[PDB]
């Protein structure tokens, strides 16, 4: 029942592989549906073609700004922003998928994949999924980041959709 979407990653044009996530629609239905819908492109816009604008080794990989591509844009399938659904799920380890935000109740389209356990973010960022397969591709992406997050190469979401 919980959806499974995927992202085919490409660094400067060459495929790196497919990463798939399980979205916990059973605990954060509104947040999960936002991500599912952005992955299939059914509302007319979404992640296909977007890039990871902030990558920080040993922390996380951030993307989802399909409008400004700099972490200033993005929008949800509800409006530019939506409230923090709940904080039931915590940042337990690598692979956790969570919402990036500009403070409370500012969820849009930006997300981040954790490569470490980021407990200091619990209760501030809504966790809504986890990497199902492909964790090694995410670690490989870290090699293109920097202490501050600026990327070394153009890491994009070549394609995406729903598997289940």
């Amino acid at each position: 029942v919980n959806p499974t979407v995927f992202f085919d990653i490409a660094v400067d044009g060459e495929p790196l592989g497919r990463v798939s996530f399980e979205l916990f629609a059973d605990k954060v239905p509104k947040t999960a549906e936002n991500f599912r819908a952005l992955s299939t492109g059914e509302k007319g816009f979404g992640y296909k073609g977007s890039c990871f604008h902030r990558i920080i080794p040993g922390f996380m990989c951030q993307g989802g700004d399909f409008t400004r591509h700099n972490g200033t844009g993005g929008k949800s399938i509800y409006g530019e922003k939506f409230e923090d659904e709940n904080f039931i799920l915590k940042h337990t380890g690598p692979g956790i998928l969570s919402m990036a935000n500009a403070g409370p109740n500012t969820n849009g389209s930006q997300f981040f994949i954790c490569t470490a356990k980021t407990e200091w973010l619990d209760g501030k960022h809504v966790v809504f999924g986890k990497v199902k397969e492909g964790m090694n591709i995410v670690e490989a992406m870290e090699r293109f980041g920097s202490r501050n997050g600026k990327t070394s190469k153009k890491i994009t979401i070549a394609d995406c959709g729903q598997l289940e």
């Binding site: 902030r54 935000n101 500009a102 403070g103 500012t106 973010l121 997050g149």
Partner: peptide, 4 residues
């Protein structure tokens, strides 16, 4: 916010 962020994280940065």
């Amino acid at each position: 916010a962020x994280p940065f």
